[PDB]
Ligand binder design. Structure first.
Ligand code: CL
Ligand code: CL
Ligand code: CL
Ligand code: CL
Ligand code: CL
Ligand code: CL
Ligand code: CL
Ligand code: CL
Ligand code: CL
Ligand code: CL
Ligand code: CL
Ligand code: CL
Ligand code: CL
Ligand code: CL
Ligand code: CL
Ligand code: CL
Ligand code: CL
Ligand code: CL
Ligand code: CL
Ligand code: CL
Ligand code: CL
Ligand code: CL
Ligand code: CL
Lengths: 83, 92, 106, 95, 104, 93, 84, 98
């Protein structure tokens, strides 16, 4: 059936710039795919919990606050989205 | 002076392994475990009620908290077992 | 004597006590009647899961009685319980026997 | 310029900067595809997608920092998958 | 000494803090001293981060605090950094810091 | 959903840096900060009261929660500001 | 009221070695014993400091197992087996 | 396999200590450390025995956990020997020093 592979929308230069921000001087070619895997697992975890909040509230629109709460569940506190 | 669940953990042990005993140290571990899981689930159900401006923790808040807190198959099986308990209680 | 809430729900864990504990914690202004039933059900299931695995580990080692070590072996050998309990220390549990392969003679 | 000099210049540039580094629309399609796996017919507030993007980029940069220390520990300058895998193991993100 | 805040010597809102402690499922009762002490601490910590973020603004010749300056303030302060060790500041960036071994 | 402290943050900004402003995105961060810290201290004050079977959160639970949650040096300063405020409010009051 | 001093040295080379063995460590540099003492001292000071904060809050002079279990929760560590 | 080097002895020690559950630091010295540390924070503090035992179980589990990560860090650097820099890497990634 349909190809659902949007992880591949995350581009080599985006990953390289995140690594430079993390202070990385040189990057093996194998890290790009590895990175896409870790990012997918992160996002699956967060989004699974955020839609859990949404569904519990009987809403069909995921709000920033659903995401803030889902992040807290992963042990991450995000500032700037309460307003 | 944490809650003791020893009696009930014994009853479950006899259902699952009629054979086997349990040391008092091991029983202390099980008691810690029940209290810990109770506090995680109720603390989350309390946050859910508050987020949604509800005065009330129902079995819906408990269910959602179980889905949030438990991994994978454990969550599915615990959701099924909770749902069964509520259906049987409501019937009887 | 009236039929216990636990009986009515088909459970061993105490529904009545669970309802009182939820009220005693001030988690919310009100606690609905199904809440403690669903909660007791879950606590009982998870307990059954661990005691099953631990009872097994006790046999896999020729013992008739669960000690903290068997609970630890039970939890650490199970992908989901290990995750659930990832920040937990079991007193007198020790660790899983496991040596890194690089450290072993070829 | 020399590739090591270029990298270091890129480090200084990306460390002074706060802009998101992943393209907004590609990220948004990724979020939508993942959400659709769990529940069809879900919509996202655009600020929910932005929250996700801010957290994801923070996460990945933090992870690259640890990855880098793992590389330097093994006397390499080049990050490899094994550096990511070590960092995630010690972080407790995988077992 | 007219509003509850004023009486306490505070900018942060004591009456409002009391109300929030009451609506939050925290205890059956909240005494009058609790929201005073909580407001003072919230006010003190706010001032700590503004002092420091203001200093970061002035170091970069700005006159307006942005998220960047909040990030710099927190990450350069050992105490605020420990307090907020699991916090992500949206649009905060990271500290300029390159490992010595990577320099020519 | 979350409480806004913008007015108060701004009043505190004018005392500590009178000639500095703040962007609206930085004000959003500050709000998230006050809410987060409020929730941490209140949740700990609540655990403490339950642990000690007290039905009331007093300034003593708040104080102990502050010492638990803040790193040691910063807790000194915060405990001292909390105590001052309670002393003023309790004095001429 | 004896003034206790230098008890970190009661964390001996053999004790530390037995801990690393349980931790699966095959070989140990002579510098890790002092490093380990330092790491243990910090962990313990942090825990005991929060434990006593619980004890003093309750106006007790005796630190209990539950004071310790609560302190450990503050480090994000959950200890089982001491709720009795 | 290989025969009795320190290598072979270390491995038996690992097997032996991963098999048992007993605490590995002597109890009276541990208690004396606890009491010494508590002498700063407060004079005239007492410790229930089970409190000191709770502190010991937690401390030893923390060190053993930390030694596990440290080992992975040594192995990463192609060493069998753990060093302070291995501990310090582990602690940094754990966020205990960051
Ligand atoms: Cl691009
Ligand atoms: Cl590169
Ligand atoms: Cl917020
Ligand atoms: Cl209900
Ligand atoms: Cl009861
Ligand atoms: Cl009741
Ligand atoms: Cl097993
Ligand atoms: Cl093995
Ligand atoms: Cl985040
Ligand atoms: Cl290299
Ligand atoms: Cl690799
Ligand atoms: Cl990995
Ligand atoms: Cl007021
Ligand atoms: Cl009060
Ligand atoms: Cl003053
Ligand atoms: Cl030594
Ligand atoms: Cl050795
Ligand atoms: Cl317990
Ligand atoms: Cl022992
Ligand atoms: Cl002694
Ligand atoms: Cl622990
Ligand atoms: Cl070596
Ligand atoms: Cl070294």
């Amino acid at each position: 059936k349909v190809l659902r592979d949007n992880i591949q929308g995350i581009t080599k230069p985006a990953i390289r710039r995140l690594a430079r921000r993390g202070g990385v001087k040189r990057i093996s070619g194998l890290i790009y795919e590895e990175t896409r895997g870790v990012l997918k697992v992160f996002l699956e975890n967060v989004i699974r919990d955020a839609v859990t909040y949404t569904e519990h509230a009987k809403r069909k629109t995921v709000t920033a606050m659903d995401v803030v709460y889902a992040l807290k569940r992963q042990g991450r506190t995000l500032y700037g989205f309460g307003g | 002076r944490k809650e003791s669940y020893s009696i009930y953990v014994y009853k479950v042990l006899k259902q699952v392994h009629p054979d086997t005993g349990i040391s008092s140290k091991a029983m202390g571990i099980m008691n810690s475990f029940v209290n810990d899981i109770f506090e995680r689930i109720a603390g989350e159900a309390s946050r859910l009620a508050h987020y949604n401006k509800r005065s009330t923790i129902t079995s819906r808040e408990i269910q959602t908290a179980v889905r949030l807190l438990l991994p994978g198959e454990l969550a599915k099986h615990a959701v099924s077992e909770g749902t069964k308990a509520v259906t049987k209680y409501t019937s009887s | 004597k009236a039929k216990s809430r636990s009986s009515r729900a088909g459970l061993q864990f105490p529904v009545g006590r669970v309802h009182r504990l939820l009220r005693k914690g001030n988690y919310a202004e009100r606690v609905g009647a199904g809440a403690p039933v669903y909660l007791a059900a879950v606590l009982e299931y998870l307990t059954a899961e661990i005691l099953e695995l631990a009872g097994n580990a006790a046999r896999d080692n020729k013992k008739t009685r669960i000690i903290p070590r068997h609970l630890q072996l039970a939890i650490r050998n199970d992908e989901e319980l290990n995750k659930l309990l990832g920040k937990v220390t079991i007193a007198q549990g020790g660790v899983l026997p496991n040596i890194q392969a690089v450290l072993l003679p070829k | 310029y020399r590739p090591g000099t270029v990298a270091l210049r890129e480090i200084r540039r990306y460390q002074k900067s706060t802009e998101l580094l992943i393209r907004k629309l590609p990220f948004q399609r990724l979020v939508r595809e993942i959400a659709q796996d769990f529940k069809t017919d879900l919509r996202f507030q655009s600020s929910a997608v932005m929250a996700l993007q801010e957290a994801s980029e923070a996460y990945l940069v933090g992870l690259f920092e640890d990855t880098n220390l793992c590389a330097i520990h093994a006397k390499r300058v080049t990050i490899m998958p094994k550096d990511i895998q070590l960092a995630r193991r010690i972080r407790g993100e995988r077992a």
